[PDB]
Amino acid sequence: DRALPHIGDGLKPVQRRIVYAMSELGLDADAKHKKSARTVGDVLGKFHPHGDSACYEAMVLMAQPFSYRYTLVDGQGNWGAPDDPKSFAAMRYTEARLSRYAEVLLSEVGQGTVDWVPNFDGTLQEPAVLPARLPNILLNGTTGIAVGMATDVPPHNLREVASACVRLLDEPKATIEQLCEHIQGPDYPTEAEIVTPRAEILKMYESGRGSIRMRAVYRVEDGDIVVTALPHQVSGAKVLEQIAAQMQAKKLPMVADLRDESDHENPCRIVIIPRSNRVDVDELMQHLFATTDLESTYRVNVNIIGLDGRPQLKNLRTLLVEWLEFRTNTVRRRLQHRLDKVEKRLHLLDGLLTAFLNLDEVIHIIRTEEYPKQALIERFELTEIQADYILETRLRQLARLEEMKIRGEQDELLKEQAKLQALLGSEAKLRKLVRSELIKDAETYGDDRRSPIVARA
Amino acid sequence: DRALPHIGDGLKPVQRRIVYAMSELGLDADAKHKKSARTVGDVLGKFHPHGDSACYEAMVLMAQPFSYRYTLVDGQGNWGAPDDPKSFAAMRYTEARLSRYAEVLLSEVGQGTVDWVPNFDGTLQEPAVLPARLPNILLNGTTGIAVGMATDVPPHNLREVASACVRLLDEPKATIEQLCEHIQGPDYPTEAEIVTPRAEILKMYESGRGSIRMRAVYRVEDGDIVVTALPHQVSGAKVLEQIAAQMQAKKLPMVADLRDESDHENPCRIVIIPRSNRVDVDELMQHLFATTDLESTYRVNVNIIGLDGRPQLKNLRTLLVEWLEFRTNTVRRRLQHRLDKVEKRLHLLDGLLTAFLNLDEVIHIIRTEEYPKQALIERFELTEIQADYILETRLRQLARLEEMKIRGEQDELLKEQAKLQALLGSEAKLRKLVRSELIKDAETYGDDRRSPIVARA
Ligand SMILES: [Cl-]
Ligand SMILES: [Cl-]
Ligand code: NA
Ligand code: NA
Numbered sequence: 073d074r075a076l077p078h079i080g081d082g083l084k085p086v087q088r089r090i091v092y093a094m095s096e097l098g099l100d101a102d103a104k105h106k107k108s109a110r111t112v113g114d115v116l117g118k119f120h121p122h123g124d125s126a127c128y129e130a131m132v133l134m135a136q137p138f139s140y141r142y143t144l145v146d147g148q149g150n151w152g153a154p155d156d157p158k159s160f161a162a163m164r165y166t167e168a169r170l171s172r173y174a175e176v177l178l179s180e181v182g183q184g185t186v187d188w189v190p191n192f193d194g195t196l197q198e199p200a201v202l203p204a205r206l207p208n209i210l211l212n213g214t215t216g217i218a219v220g221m222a223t224d225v226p227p228h229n230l231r232e233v234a235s236a237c238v239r240l241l242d243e244p245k246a247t248i249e250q251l252c253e254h255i256q257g258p259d260y261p262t263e264a265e266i267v268t269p270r271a272e273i274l275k276m277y278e279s280g281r282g283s284i285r286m287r288a289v290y291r292v293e294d295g296d297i298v299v300t301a302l303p304h305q306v307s308g309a310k311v312l313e314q315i316a317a318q319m320q321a322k323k324l325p326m327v328a329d330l331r332d333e334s335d336h337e338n339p340c341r342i343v344i345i346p347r348s349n350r351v352d353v354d355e356l357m358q359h360l361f362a363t364t365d366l367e368s369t370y371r372v373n374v375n376i377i378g379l380d381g382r383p384q385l386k387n388l389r390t391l392l393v394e395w396l397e398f399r400t401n402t403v404r405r406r407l408q409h410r411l412d413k414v415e416k417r418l419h420l421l422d423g424l425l426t427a428f429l430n431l432d433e434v435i436h437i438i439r440t441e442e443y444p445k446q447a448l449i450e451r452f453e454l455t456e457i458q459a460d461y462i463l464e465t466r467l468r469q470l471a472r473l474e475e476m477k478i479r480g481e482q483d484e485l486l487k488e489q490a491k492l493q494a495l496l497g498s499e500a501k502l503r504k505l506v507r508s509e510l511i512k513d514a515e516t517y518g519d520d521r522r523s524p525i526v527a528r529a
Numbered sequence: 530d531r532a533l534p535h536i537g538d539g540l541k542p543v544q545r546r547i548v549y550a551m552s553e554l555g556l557d558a559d560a561k562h563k564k565s566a567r568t569v570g571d572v573l574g575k576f577h578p579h580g581d582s583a584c585y586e587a588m589v590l591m592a593q594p595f596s597y598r599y600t601l602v603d604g605q606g607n608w609g610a611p612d613d614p615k616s617f618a619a620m621r622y623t624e625a626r627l628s629r630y631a632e633v634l635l636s637e638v639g640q641g642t643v644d645w646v647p648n649f650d651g652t653l654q655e656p657a658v659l660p661a662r663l664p665n666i667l668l669n670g671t672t673g674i675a676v677g678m679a680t681d682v683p684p685h686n687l688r689e690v691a692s693a694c695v696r697l698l699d700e701p702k703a704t705i706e707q708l709c710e711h712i713q714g715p716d717y718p719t720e721a722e723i724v725t726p727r728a729e730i731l732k733m734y735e736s737g738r739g740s741i742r743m744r745a746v747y748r749v750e751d752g753d754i755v756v757t758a759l760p761h762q763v764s765g766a767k768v769l770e771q772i773a774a775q776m777q778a779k780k781l782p783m784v785a786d787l788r789d790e791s792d793h794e795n796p797c798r799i800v801i802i803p804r805s806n807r808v809d810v811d812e813l814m815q816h817l818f819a820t821t822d823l824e825s826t827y828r829v830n831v832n833i834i835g836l837d838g839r840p841q842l843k844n845l846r847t848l849l850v851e852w853l854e855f856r857t858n859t860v861r862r863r864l865q866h867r868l869d870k871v872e873k874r875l876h877l878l879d880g881l882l883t884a885f886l887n888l889d890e891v892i893h894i895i896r897t898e899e900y901p902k903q904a905l906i907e908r909f910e911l912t913e914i915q916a917d918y919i920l921e922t923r924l925r926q927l928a929r930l931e932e933m934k935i936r937g938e939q940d941e942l943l944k945e946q947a948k949l950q951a952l953l954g955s956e957a958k959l960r961k962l963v964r965s966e967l968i969k970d971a972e973t974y975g976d977d978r979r980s981p982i983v984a985r986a
Contacts, residue, residue, distance in 0.1 A: 121566035438927060464924070471895050
């Protein structure tokens with residue numbers, strides 16, 4: 073009974089339901105925050121009918137910027153703090169709406185891009201996989217208490233991953249090293265350094281399995297060592313217990329005192345005070361990195377669910393080539409979906425035009441005929457769909473009808489129709505559209521690398 | 530932090546929210562059952578944002594016919610059994626819709642009868658008190674684990690209570706004894722007998738405080754004593770433990786064996802097997818009634834919340850006179866509400882008629898005027914409301930307009946308007962309407978007395 077993330081949008085059922093539930097409640101990034109309970113209530117009633125705690129815990133995690141590399145929920149109130157991600161207030165107090173980044177997963181939902189599946193009682197439908205515009209699987213990875221999970225995917229930089237996709241679109245046979253010219257490695261939500269060598273980072277992407285080793289970043293100010301950023305999910309308080317324990321065992325005669333000076337706005341500020349300005353700082357820290365959580369490791373095992381529905385230990389190339397296949401399939405359905413709405417709209421205008429051109433008579437037929445609909449159909453050779461649309465027309469909407477506005481919209485649609493057939497008519501034109509959107513989206517939603525990679529940056 | 534029932538509809542906030550939530554989800558008695566979770570989810574998200582357990586427990590209680598004298602929820606699945614009302618399945622399995630009786634509390638909700646109050650976060654509104662058509666306060670009383678509660682009101686027969694209301698409407702000064710010519714006493718959901726004397730039942734209604742003593746009903750078949758109905762909320766299994774314990778203490782040499790033969794359809798069937806057909810049955814049972822739960826007592830303390838918002842220990846007369854005041858106020862607003870919709874409708878027809886009588890010109894003005902709305906207003910002396918309604922008219926709706934249908938509906942409404950002004954114009958005409966509805970409603974939703982009162986029936 074373990075959940076594995078889907079390559080498509082990088083989500084597990086728990087997560088997918090919370091976000092879908094929220095976009096259905098209209099809680100997008102432009103909406104006003106609504107009490108968390110409202111969202112939990114919907115998820116509980118419509119999608120996962122077990123409990124308020126299971127759901128809300130996964131939801132709080134999405135709103136924590138130190139848990140998710142790209143948050144999916146924008147939260148107001150107490151949504152926990154860095155050293156204890158469990159100190160979140162009850163759901164009756166916190167308020168939530170979706171993230172701006174959430175748009176990456178949801179903007180294309182109503183455009184025939186999703187495979188709908190019945191919910192738990194068959195009364196509503198839910199998305200099987202969200203139409204992600206960027207590979208959230210690598211961007212956010214597997215977030216939360218990682219010791220329980222078998223599958224581990226670290227987070228990545230959105231812009232680096234997007235550039236690697238561009239590369240595959242241009243050079244379909246680009247090897248993994250070539251993809252690593254753009255993707256430096258993982259990118260965690262912390263200024264801490266990844267010290268794994270480039271050669272090992274490369275093998276991890278070739279294999280799908282490996283290890284990442286991060287290291288806290290420090291500076292010196294007034295002779296005191298100040299750690300400004302810790303490895304991912306490392307408790308600053310736990311680090312102090314560890315150093316303090318060594319002080320008790322007479323292993324740190326060079327350490328005088330420790331102080332946790334992190335405040336509201338400054339999340340990490342652990343001060344290690346040396347016995348004197350004659351203490352070798354770099355020698356001390358090397359020891360602390362080897363003996364405390366100031367240097368911690370992370371597992372990698374990209375065993376995820378693919379488009380064929382079965383799991384696979386996927387290396388970076390295998391994963392991105394497959395994600396691009398998912399993305400192009402998605403964009404193809406988005407265009408097909410639109411083309412259908414354009415063609416239904418052209419059919420209505422073709423009917424509406426005829427009605428406008430014979431409007432005097434149309435209004436006469438409507439006011440003086442036992443069967444008005446069936447009379448217009450026989451007279452002006454209209455389909456039933458055209459006839460209904462004419463009869464649904466209100467008198468205020470009848471006032472605004474102008475022959476040129478009808479032919480003007482009819483022109484726009486005929487050319488938008490030509491554009492869509494050209495895009496669906498060749499793989500080459502899709503590819504450029506996908507490439508074009510990967511680049512805009514990267515500009516819109518992307519950010520600078522946070523965790524530096526010592527082996528490169 | 531204790532909840533007291535409101536005289537108006539006899540509900541506490543917990544209860545009121547669950548039913549309102551359910552009628553808002555469209556789960557009335559004509560709708561299809563929907564998974565209990567859906568309802569719990571709404572209550573949790575919109576009205577009481579604490580938990581799935583608190584809400585669902587109160588909800589299960591409403592669906593149990595052996596807990597509520599008049600159930601408010603019709604449930605499918607395992608909604609617990611008589612000897613253990615806690616053996617209900619999880620909310621992801623059970624299904625629920627409202628009761629037929631629920632109509633008594635909800636049919637008048639959308640008719641300006643309720644005082645709306647903001648919900649917990651000020652985003653929606655909830656009813657302060659439901660517009661009950663019958664005094665649910667006495668009909669259902671205070672249901673659930675009564676040891677925790679300070680306020681206790683036993684259930685009553687709907688038809689008996691309705692007749693007492695009629696009596697107060699006819700004889701406003703009718704004394705409590707006179708009200709007791711109709712209300713025999715409490716009426717629990719069990720065939721068991723109430724053995725409290727009539728004189729004490731009378732003092733309890735005069736006081737608002739007292740005690741009810743019920744007794745299990747039995748018959749003899751093939752020499753074995755068969756208890757067919759137990760006092761309210763008495764566990765058949767607990768009774769057997771009690772008798773068995775006496776057998777261990779050598780107090781029942783006349784008792785040979787005990788058997789719980791209750792099945793799916795037969796809720797109570799406890800067989801006490803005497804040592805021989807020579808055992809005095811009535812002498813044995815008298816002893817068991819005095820020494821076991823086969824005869825149990827119930828407290829009464831009608832300390833409820835009145836229309837003035839403050840609590841009061843209310844005797845039967847005080848309570849019913851006040852409930853009738855609530856009922857007439859409710860019906861008065863229901864009529865006022867309707868009268869307003871009739872008058873708005875007459876205003877639209879007055880405008881629609883003029884438009885039909887000058888339709889050739891109206892359609893011309895609509896097709897050839899820079900400002901159509903503002904032109905009709907100046908031409909035919911129409912209010913803005915009338916003008917909008919004309920312009921909203923669809924072409925299919927324009928085909929069905931016939932001068933006689935407009936004047937025909939205009940006649941009906943002018944006479945319905947006259948009826949409503951006559952009812953609101955005197956207390957005497959309201960009273961008869963209230964009386965008339967109390968009687969129909971009693972016929973529709975009422976049933977025979979279940980718990981016989983030995984002192985009378
Ligand atoms: Cl796992
Ligand atoms: Cl109480
Ligand atoms: Na792990
Ligand atoms: Na009590």
